[PDB]
Amino acid sequence: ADLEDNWETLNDNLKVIEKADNAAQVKDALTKMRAAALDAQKATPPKLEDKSPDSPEMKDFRHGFDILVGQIDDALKLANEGKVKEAQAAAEQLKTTRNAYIQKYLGSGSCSQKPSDKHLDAIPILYYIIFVIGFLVNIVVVTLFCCQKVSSIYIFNLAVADLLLLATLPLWATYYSYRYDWLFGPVMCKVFGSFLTLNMFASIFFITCMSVDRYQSVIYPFWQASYIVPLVWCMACLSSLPTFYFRDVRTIEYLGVNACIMAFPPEKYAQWSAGIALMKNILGFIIPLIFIATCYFGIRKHLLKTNSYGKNRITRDQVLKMAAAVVLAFIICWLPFHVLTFLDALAWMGVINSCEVIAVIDLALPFAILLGFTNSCVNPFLYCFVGNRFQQKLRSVFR
Amino acid sequence: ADLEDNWETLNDNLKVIEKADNAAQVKDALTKMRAAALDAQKATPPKLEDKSPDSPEMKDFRHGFDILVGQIDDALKLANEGKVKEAQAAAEQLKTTRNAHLDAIPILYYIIFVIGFLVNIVVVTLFCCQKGPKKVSSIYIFNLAVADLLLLATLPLWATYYSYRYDWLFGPVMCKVFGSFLTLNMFASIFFITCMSVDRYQSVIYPFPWQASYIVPLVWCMACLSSLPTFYFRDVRTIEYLGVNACIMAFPPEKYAQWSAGIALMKNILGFIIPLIFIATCYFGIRKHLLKTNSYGKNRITRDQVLKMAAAVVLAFIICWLPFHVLTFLDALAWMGVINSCEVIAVIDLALPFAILLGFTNSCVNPFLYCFVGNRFQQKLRSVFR
Ligand SMILES: CCc1nc2ccc(N(Cc3ccccc3)C(=O)c3cccs3)cc2c(=O)n1Cc1ccc(-c2ccccc2-c2nn[nH]n2)cc1
Ligand SMILES: CCc1nc2ccc(N(Cc3ccccc3)C(=O)c3cccs3)cc2c(=O)n1Cc1ccc(-c2ccccc2-c2nn[nH]n2)cc1
């Protein structure tokens, strides 16, 4: 009798029609669907719950099922006439009506405000400011090898991953400016969508390599790079496959705009939205932060286990300052984004059903995304512009 | 006691050191290797069998094992001190020790230079004074022609460098500059070839302005970043056994075999594997959309000619670049210690200057394959769409 369970009854029986052999299978499935459609029409969605029945958005909700039951009756007509392929063709029009629901009541469509209502002129400006500043500081990192170590190889790969990540900012600023109207074709929606995720993870995984490398340099003062570097680009490539698979241009009917969305299976759209959001947290923040934090306290342990003289005290704390800066910068730049992503996942799970909260997440998200790119501006100062001085202060305490 | 069986004993124990947990495993393996190295030093190879022991090539053979036993003793020193990762690092230098002119080539290089330069001259000059800066696909054509033109412009250098039996007479600064200029325009060519296949595919699957202002700089940016490890490692170094100053890939000598194997894999993945994935997927992507549309009359002749133009861009790229990357992958396996037979290593050396020429020959194919024959692809794609 629940709305979510009735859509499951509608989508499971819609699959039966596609793989049906005889007209009796189609008729049976459509009879179950007509019952579920009328039962779902009586239900009230979790979003716009405390809403009057005479309201236009509640009258539109029940109207959607009048269209749906009408399409079911046209397919039932054909099934009873013994017209299987005709009924299966008529039943395929139910998907168009089902998609008009998932982009309205299932999501923050008929909940949170439209992009036109939440458009700030500062966002495209801020995105170009971080683009030119971040692009020029990573140009220094790369050209610094020309005018002048296994660790240096990870620096270059980090600078390349950062420099290609920041190179996508002119696209998102343009896409935001045209109120989410993708004017580059659906092919570049998959390609640059994947290219973004590829270099984002390549940045985060090479940050993780640096902490493991600096830790292994502290605990053990004393071919690995020629296999770890291709492997880091391999894992970033595999982590960016769900982006290539689901990113696609789809027309948002109530906005009349072609948006580069995450075109998930409509029959399990909330499940996928919640699932992929958890993948972002675990794979992009939780797991790399476990490594970065463990390597910090791992280094912090060994420096409090060597010597405590006054001359070697200054040298010890400056190594710890460089060590605490790589963990704090990663948290400040990526924690706001993953907090909003975890809250977003709870909204798809049905935990958060407040449009006030969901609206906060929507307007905060373009800013939280910018801090993620801002981490690529910080990396030159954390690793390249310190690596030359971190090495001599680590050899001083070791002697 | 056989030389082949002693090298098998040396290679099997190297696999033990890599996967060793404790210093005793490393010490045990190196003790078996020191025995196998001294036993192999006493053996005479099948080649240069009927050769005097006082001969320089016989003294060099036994000298190679004196270097090999030396590195084993340096590793045994660390293993006995309880330095596992240090001993495993020292034992990896044993691989470097284990791995240890045609007049037609400079002529052929100048033939491809003048033919390729003149075919890209007709394309560059066409776009400016006899056409215009309109259309999006035409912008990639011009950038491809510029990248090809500048790539073919380096052929007089490699022909001269080959003529002086690899004696770089231009200074170590131009070894880094033209070395990177070569790689820059090589990747700029391959990446704009990749753009063309993605553009033609997007024109087929979606028959219905901004994208060009962003992609052209992004492609040249990725070309500059791909040619940086070239600028950092290419340098002039004296090759003692040839007595010549060669413009080589000056990797750290203590870590030369790992770097040579690593950068060879970079060439295959970034310069052939990844771009070929795009070119092949866009071909079968186009091939899919045309075959699902039922053609049978005049439209069938129109459909197959579009497929002929489509199959020509993937086949030309494979014919011109696959020989080079096959030899590069085999070269990488030789540095990894996979390929031990010097006969196939000698084949790579003489087959490499020819395989490099086919790479430049792809820049002779691109003007015909996209600007000239590719102009009909525009008219014949709108005919099947209508
Ligand atoms: C800082 C890096 C970053 N830049 C972005 C730039 C733009 C946008 N936006 C929204 C936007 C548009 C214009 C201005 C401002 C915002 C988009 O619409 C598009 C994204 C990809 C193609 S279009 C989102 C992001 C954005 O979420 N991130 C972070 C991030 C987190 C997680 C994943 C991820 C991990 C695992 C599996 C799948 C994904 C996954 N998420 N979205 N696609 N793929 C990818 C990226
Ligand atoms: C067709 C394009 C091409 N022209 C070349 C012209 C000459 C030579 N040769 C050998 C030679 C000399 C004289 C006559 C004939 C051959 C050289 O000694 C020099 C090369 C660069 C400065 S000197 C090699 C090549 C050659 O390998 N290639 C292909 C190629 C493949 C891969 C990379 C590459 C990718 C990623 C990272 C690094 C590199 C990288 N390899 N060498 N430096 N940088 C660059 C180029």
Name residue, tokens 């820059």. B184
**Which of A245, A247, A167 lies closest to A202 in space, CA to CA?**
A167
* Alpha carbons B334 and B340: distance in angstroms, whole number: 7
Same structural domain for residues A157 and A302? yes
* Residue A2 main-chain phi, psi, to 5 deg: -70, 150
Residues in chain A: 399
Contact B157, B174 (CB under 8 A): no
* Alpha carbons A332 and B368: distance in angstroms, whole number: 54
Name residue, tokens 């909700």. A61
Burial of B35 (0-12, 13-18, 19+ CB in 10 A): middle
> Do A171 and B198 count as a contact with CB atoms less than 8 A apart?
no
Q: Which amino acid is at B158?
A: W
HSE-CB for B324 with a 13 A CA cutoff = 22
Q: Which atom of ligand 2 lies nearest, measured to the CA of B178?
A: 22
**Which of A112, A109, A186, A90 lies closest to B203 in space, CA to CA?**
A186
Same structural domain for residues A180 and A309? yes
Q: Which residue of A has its CA nearest to B255?
A: A223
* Alpha carbons A5 and A40: distance in angstroms, whole number: 9
Q: Residue B303, Cβ neighbours under 10 Å: how many? A: 19
Torsion of CA B144, B146, B150, B152, to 10 degrees: 50
A259 C-alpha to center of ligand 1: Å?
13
Q: Which amino acid is at B269?
A: I
CA distances from B9 to A248, B18, B69 (A): 56, 15, 14
Q: Which atom of ligand 1 lies nearest, measured to the CA of A189?
A: 22
Contacting residues for A84 by C-beta, under 8 A, at least 6 apart: A20, A22, A23, A26
Contact A379, A162 (CB under 8 A): yes
Q: Is A184 on the interface with B (CB under 8 A)?
A: yes
* Alpha carbons B107 and B117: distance in angstroms, whole number: 15
What is the maximal distance between C-alpha atoms in chain A? 95
Q: Which atom of ligand 2 lies nearest, measured to the CA of B168?
A: 23
Q: Which chain A residues are closer than 8 Å to B218 by Cβ?
A: 167
A145 C-alpha to center of ligand 2: Å?
21
Contact B11, B94 (CB under 8 A): no
Smallest Cβ distance to B258: which of A146, A167, A223?
A223
Q: Which residue of B has its CA nearest to A138?
A: B225
Helix, strand or coil, per DSSP, at residue A262:
strand
Contact B127, B149 (CB under 8 A): no
Q: Which helix (H) or strand (E) holds A252?
A: strand A247-252
HSE-CB for A373 with a 13 A CA cutoff = 27
In a domain, A110, yes or no: no
Q: Specify the number of domains making up chain A.
A: 2
Contact B75, B14 (CB under 8 A): no
Name residue, tokens 């997440």. A361
> How far from each other are the two terminal CA atoms of chain B, in whole angstroms?
78
* Alpha carbons B261 and B95: distance in angstroms, whole number: 12
Smallest Cβ distance to B206: which of A174, A185, A230?
A185
- Give the residue from A45, A76, A103 where a domain finishes: A103
Q: Residue B217, Cβ neighbours under 10 Å: how many? A: 11
Task: State the alpha helices, DSSP H only, in chain A.
Answer: 3-18, 23-42, 56-81, 84-90, 94-102, 122-147, 150-166, 169-177, 185-219, 225-239, 241-246, 269-281, 287-303, 311-348, 355-379, 385-398
Size of interface A-B (CB pairs under 8 A): 50
Nearest CA, atom 15, ligand 1: A366
Q: Which amino acid is at B88?
A: Q
Contact B220, B186 (CB under 8 A): no
Q: Is B296 on the interface with A (CB under 8 A)?
A: no
Contacting residues for B179 by C-beta, under 8 A, at least 6 apart: B230, B231, B234, B247
In a domain, A109, yes or no: no
Q: Which chain A residues are closer than 8 Å to B205 by Cβ?
A: 187
Boundaries of domain holding B71? 3-99
R_g of chain B, CA atoms, integer Å: 26
Helices A385-398 and A311-348, packing angle to 10 deg: 130
Find which of B18, B211, B227 to mutate to test the A interface (most A CBs within 10 Å of its CB).
Answer: B211
Q: Which atom of ligand 2 lies nearest, measured to the CA of B162?
A: 13
Contacting residues for A339 by C-beta, under 8 A, at least 6 apart: A368
* Alpha carbons A289 and B82: distance in angstroms, whole number: 33
> Do A188 and B201 count as a contact with CB atoms less than 8 A apart?
no
* Residue A310 main-chain phi, psi, to 5 deg: -60, -40
In a domain, A108, yes or no: no
Contacting residues for B116 by C-beta, under 8 A, at least 6 apart: B148, B152, B155, B360, B361, B363, B364
* Alpha carbons B180 and B224: distance in angstroms, whole number: 8
Contact B285, B201 (CB under 8 A): yes
Q: Which amino acid is at A119?
A: H
**Which of B277, B134, B295 lies closest to B201 in space, CA to CA?**
B277
A226 C-alpha to center of ligand 2: Å?
20
* Alpha carbons A12 and A94: distance in angstroms, whole number: 13
Residues in chain B: 386
- Give the residue from A55, A74, A103 where a domain finishes: A103
Q: Which chain A residues are closer than 8 Å to B206 by Cβ?
A: 185-187
* Alpha carbons B316 and B38: distance in angstroms, whole number: 52
Label residue A257 left, alpha or beta by phi (over 0 means left) and psi (-120 to 50 means alpha): beta
Find the CATH number of the domain harbouring A381.
1.20.1070.10
Q: Which chain B residues are closer than 8 Å to A156 by Cβ?
A: 228-229
* Alpha carbons A217 and A390: distance in angstroms, whole number: 11
SS3 track for B202-264: HHHHCCCCCHHHHHHHHHHHHHHHHCHHHHHHEEEEEECCCCEEEEEECCCHHHHHHHHHHHH
> Do B202 and A185 count as a contact with CB atoms less than 8 A apart?
yes
Q: Is A243 in the pocket of ligand 1 (CB under 6 A)?
A: yes
Q: Which chain A residues are closer than 8 Å to B262 by Cβ?
A: 225-226, 229
Q: Is B229 in the pocket of ligand 2 (CB under 6 A)?
A: yes
Q: Is B359 in the pocket of ligand 2 (CB under 6 A)?
A: yes
Q: Is A279 in the pocket of ligand 1 (CB under 6 A)?
A: yes
* Residue A252 main-chain phi, psi, to 5 deg: -90, 95
Q: Which residue of B has its CA nearest to A148?
A: B232
Quick one: resolution in A?
2.8
**Which of B254, B241, B232, B262 lies closest to B332 in space, CA to CA?**
B262
Q: Which residue of B has its CA nearest to A169?
A: B214
Contact B100, B63 (CB under 8 A): no
Contact B201, B282 (CB under 8 A): yes
Which residue(s) pair with A251 in the sheet?
Answer: A258
Q: Which amino acid is at A323?
A: A
Torsion of CA A143, A147, A153, A157, to 10 degrees: 0
**Own/partner long-range contacts of B265-269 (Cβ < 8 Å, ≥24 apart):** B265/A226, B265/A230, B265/B329, B265/B332, B266/B229, B267/B325, B267/B328, B268/B325, B268/B328, B268/B329, B268/B332, B269/A230
CA distances from A28 to A81, A112, B279 (A): 14, 38, 47
Find which of A132, A135, A187 to mutate to test the B interface (most B CBs within 10 Å of its CB).
Answer: A187
Same structural domain for residues A383 and A250? yes
Burial of B342 (0-12, 13-18, 19+ CB in 10 A): exposed
Question: Per residue in A215-247, is it b (16+ CB within 10 Å) or e — as a string?
Answer: bbbbeeeebebbebbeebbeebbebbebbbebb
**Residue A231, both tokens:** 């492997």
Same structural domain for residues A96 and A138? no
> How far from each other are the two terminal CA atoms of chain A, in whole angstroms?
74
Tell me how close the Cα of B293 comes to any Cα of chain A, in angstroms.
20
* Alpha carbons B357 and A226: distance in angstroms, whole number: 28
Question: Per residue in B188-213, is it b (16+ CB within 10 Å) or e — as a string?
Answer: bbbbbbbbbbbbbbbbbeeeeeebbe
* Alpha carbons A128 and A139: distance in angstroms, whole number: 16
- Give the residue from A103, A136, A152 where a domain finishes: A103
**Residue B382, both tokens:** 């709108």
Same structural domain for residues A222 and A268? yes
**Residue B316, both tokens:** 């030309």
Find the CATH number of the domain harbouring B62.
1.20.120.10
Find which of B95, B176, B210, B286 to mutate to test the A interface (most A CBs within 10 Å of its CB).
Answer: B210
SS3 track for chain B: CCHHHHHHHHHHHHHHHHCCCCHHHHHHHHHHHHHHHHHHHHCCCCCCCCCCCCCHHHHHHHHHHHHHHHHHHHHHHHHHHCCHHHHHHHHHHHHHHHHCCCCHHHHHHHHHHHHHHHHHHHHHHHHHHCCCCCCCHHHHHHHHHHHHHHHHCCHHHHHHHHHCCCCCCCCHHHHHHHHHHHHHHHHHHHHHHHHHHHHHHHHHHCCCCCHHHHHHHHHHHHHHHHCHHHHHHEEEEEECCCCEEEEEECCCHHHHHHHHHHHHHHHHHHHHHHHHHHHHHHHHHHHHHHHHCCCCCHHHHHHHHHHHHHHHHHHHHHHHHHHHHHHHHHHHHHHCCCCCCHHHHHHHHHHHHHHHHHHHHHHHHHHHHHHHCHHHHHHHHHHHHC
SS3 track for B138-169: HHHHHHHHHHHHHHHCCHHHHHHHHHCCCCCC
**Which of A32, A27, A38, A28 lies closest to A10 in space, CA to CA?**
A32
According to the entry, how was the structure determined?
X-ray
